[PDB]
Design a protein around this ligand. Structure first.
Ligand SMILES: Nc1ncnc2c1ncn2[C@@H]1O[C@H](COP(=O)(O)OP(=O)(O)OP(=O)(O)O)[C@@H](O)[C@H]1O
Ligand SMILES: Nc1ncnc2c1ncn2[C@@H]1O[C@H](COP(=O)(O)OP(=O)(O)OP(=O)(O)O)[C@@H](O)[C@H]1O
Lengths: 710, 70
């Protein structure tokens, strides 16, 4: 088919011969139709490949209607009734230069091109159209690749940079390519409002990448074809330069600044995370010409670098920082894109899963912007069993809630059944039963600690502050294990509980738990700075220097601490724990098997001694760790037994285990030590029990998969 | 203001003009940038005005020599 732009003239050329109602369509006709007026809006005048190629049309503007008025007049129906194959060939004849100048359809040049024989003054004095001489000449001048489609704007190739690498997604939008977006409709509007703001049209999108900052621009691009775009912003469309620079190869990027200036702010530009010193500096001389609406974006990072220098190029720029979208955001796009990426993968899904995805995803996402990771996990979930579907065995092209959440998301870390059974409420109600499994006896620590974090859970935690604890007893009482149990129970992670020594990391460790940089600023940061979920083990806190206890109270208070870069980071996901062993003295009361509030007063007295009441009053619960009953002693057995079977009977040998209190009293009695508990017995068992087998292993008289107690 | 009108009413646009203080204020207030100047407004003077009102007029229903300011 002919080019619309061409055909726009062509039918108007048929219209041309119609206005004077010409008898026939004949070579010199469209010489008028090619031209509304001498304006380059009519390229055939000046911007024509001929005026630049051979024949300038200035005075040669004179003759065109001179013929079409001197055509013998006709009546309406015979007007444009005939191609008059002398002219009618130009229909086909226009397809000749699409060869030598490499085009496909029939364009403004081509419709022009065919005419190059008789469409003219052809005489002894011939003001005419040179055949190959003007076009193949200047059809590179014009354009240099003309051909795209019958559709499209003027085919004068004003800007080669805009036609080359400038991507119009509004095209793609009416082409239906991109996926519609949601919920930045605030930012969408506001940034477009910024765009609609005459003062600062340019926004600065701020935030960490992967969040949808150009997904913003997606619906923005859509609002262009959705035509919500403001009057100020109507005539403009989307260009977004994804910079591929590949003599200066950049000035192209600078030359296009005219090509848009050609369009005269008929578009908008959007650059995403590349905002930096360019050549030289990026952008402005076109913007700095006062012109050029652009959609700016960045992480605070690139915002921290060059635009900090001037700030009066940001005089165009309202900085808008995106936040990681809410659940419904994920949900709704999922709601929109669940059918998408299940049809992208040709499968089906439970929306039950879909929302449930975001749940743990948002919860345990260590890094990314959730919908991505979600859509990742989704596509992961999708493709994963879809790949399981398309490859034999598959039965479910739909996919479940659970595994599609858990088993899929289990490829972050794992522990699905615990990722399963928890309603995020199920912890507390079931915790002190669960906690009863780990730390033996200690019903105080069972209730008190948990119930106090049941206050830091239940949703009753402050928007910023964790639960707070200071504990006395054996170190080895299951104290750490408690907070490991906490770390294990609460966060399903053993990494959560972190060794933090108040004692030795103490005074100028205020520099070494973080440092305004004069790389972690110090220990405490990227522990949590990576992972806001954590469990804090603060070692013998009263042995710390008071230098930190202020910012330690600043940990207690407000649950956040100014970092080395100064950031004040959320610890309230955690539970602040303090440690004191000084009651080992006061375990004298526990030696007398007192109710320890006998000395817990003195304990409270002892701790109230050294510290700010603030620093003191933060503690939710202080729990003395009670005297070990034989149970409390000998229930530590299965702990060992567990960490026995974890390897032999589990992760290596598949060897069964049995003991008797005979041997266990031959253990625990010795196995228990007063001050250190059975922490001795652990590294005791390491041979005479263990290596007794490591003996018997190759001694082999009795073999694997057996058990014999001594 | 003077430059465009003297391009056109002379020959092209035959154009009699109107000014809201809006534009009168706008162009001065809004159109002029402190830092980047009315230099863009110089282009904008087209846009919100010439581009706008010609577009208003180019239909011709608002006739030649007529004017409508925003
Ligand atoms: N609300 C949404 N609706 C539809 N698709 C979305 C939405 N948010 C993100 N996407 C999808 O995310 C992908 C691209 O996301 P996008 O690039 O916008 O994130 P980003 O934060 O802008 O990364 P960058 O900051 O480097 O531009 C596309 O596949 C797009 O369809
Ligand atoms: N009631 C109990 N509950 C849980 N673990 C207990 C209990 N009594 C003794 N233990 C033992 O405590 C061990 C770990 O103690 P924990 O780590 O809590 O103290 P710790 O502070 O780390 O020891 P330390 O700090 O002195 O090196 C476990 O391996 C377990 O066998």
């Amino acid at each position: 088919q002919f080019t619309e732009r061409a055909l726009t003239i062509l039918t108007l050329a048929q219209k041309l011969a119609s206005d004077h109602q010409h008898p026939q369509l004949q070579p010199i006709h469209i010489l008028a139709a090619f031209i509304e007026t001498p304006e380059d809006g009519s390229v055939p005048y000046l911007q024509n490949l001929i005026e630049k190629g051979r024949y300038d049309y200035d005075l040669f503007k004179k003759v065109v209607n001179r013929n079409l008025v001197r055509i013998p007049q006709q009546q309406p129906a015979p007007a444009e009734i005939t191609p008059s194959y002398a002219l009618g060939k130009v229909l086909q004849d226009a397809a000749k230069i699409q060869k030598q100048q490499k085009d496909s359809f029939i364009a403004q040049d081509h419709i022009l091109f065919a005419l190059f024989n008789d469409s003219s003054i052809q005489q002894i004095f011939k003001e005419a159209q040179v055949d190959i001489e003007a076009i193949k000449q200047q059809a590179l001048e014009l354009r240099g690749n003309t051909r795209i489609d019958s559709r499209g704007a003027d085919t004068n190739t004003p800007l080669e940079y805009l036609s080359k690498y400038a991507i119009d997604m509004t095209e793609q939008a009416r082409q239906g390519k991109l996926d519609p977006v949601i919920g930045r409709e605030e930012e969408i509007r506001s940034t477009i409002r910024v765009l609609a703001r005459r003062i600062k049209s340019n926004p600065c999108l701020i935030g960490e990448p992967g969040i949808g900052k150009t997904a913003i621009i997606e619906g923005v691009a859509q609002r262009i074809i959705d035509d919500d775009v403001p009057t100020i912003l109507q005539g403009a469309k989307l260009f977004s330069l994804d910079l591929a620079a590949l003599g200066d190869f950049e000035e192209r990027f600078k030359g296009v600044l005219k090509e848009i200036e050609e369009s005269k702010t008929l578009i908008v530009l959007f650059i995403d995370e590349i905002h930096m010193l360019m050549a030289a500096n990026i952008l402005k001389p076109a913007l700095s010409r006062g012109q050029l609406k652009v959609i700016g974006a960045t992480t605070n990072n690139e915002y921290r670098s060059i635009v900090e220098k001037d700030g009066a190029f940001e005089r165009r720029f309202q900085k808008i920082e995106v936040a990681e979208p809410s659940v419904r955001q994920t949900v709704a796009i999922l709601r929109g894109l669940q059918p998408k990426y299940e049809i992208h993968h040709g499968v089906r899904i439970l929306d039950s899963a879909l929302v449930t995805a975001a749940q743990l995803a948002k919860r345990y996402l260590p890094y990314r912007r959730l919908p991505d990771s979600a859509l990742d996990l989704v596509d992961i979930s999708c493709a994963g069993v879809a790949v399981a579907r398309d490859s034999k065995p598959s039965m479910i092209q739909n996919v479940v809630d659970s595994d599609t959440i858990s088993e899929t998301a289990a490829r972050l870390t794992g522990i699905p059944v615990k990722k399963l059974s928890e309603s995020e409420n199920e912890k507390l109600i079931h915790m002190e039963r669960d906690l009863s499994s780990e730390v033996v006896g200690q019903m105080d620590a069972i209730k008190a600690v948990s119930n106090a974090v049941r206050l830091s859970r239940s949703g009753l935690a402050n928007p910023r502050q964790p639960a707070s604890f200071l504990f006395l007893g054996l170190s080895g009482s299951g104290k750490t294990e408690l907070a490991k149990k906490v770390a294990g129970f609460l966060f399903n992670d053993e990494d959560m509980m972190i060794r933090v020594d108040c004692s030795e990391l103490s005074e100028k460790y205020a520099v070494s738990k973080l440092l305004g940089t004069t790389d972690e600023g110090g220990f405490l940061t990227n522990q949590l700075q990576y992972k806001p979920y954590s469990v804090l083990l603060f070692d013998e806190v009263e042995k710390a220097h008071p230098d930190v206890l202020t910012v330690m109270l600043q940990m207690l208070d407000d649950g956040r601490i100014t970092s080395g870069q100064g950031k004040t980071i959320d610890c309230s996901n955690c539970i602040v724990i303090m440690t004191s062993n000084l009651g080992a003295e006061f375990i004298n009361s526990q030696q007398g098997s007192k109710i320890q509030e006998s000395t817990k007063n003195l304990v409270m007295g002892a701790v109230r001694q050294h510290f700010r009441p603030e620093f003191l009053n933060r503690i939710s619960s202080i729990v003395i760790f009670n005297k070990l009953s034989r149970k409390a002693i000998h229930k530590i057995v299965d702990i060992r037994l567990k960490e026995i079977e974890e390897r032999f009977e589990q992760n290596d040998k598949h060897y069964k285990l049995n003991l008797t209190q005979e041997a266990k009293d031959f253990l625990a009695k010795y196995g228990y030590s007063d001050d250190m508990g059975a922490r001795p017995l652990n590294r005791l068992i390491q041979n005479e029990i263990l290596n007794k087998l490591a003996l018997r292993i190759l001694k082999n008289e009795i073999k694997d998969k057996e058990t014999v107690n001594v």
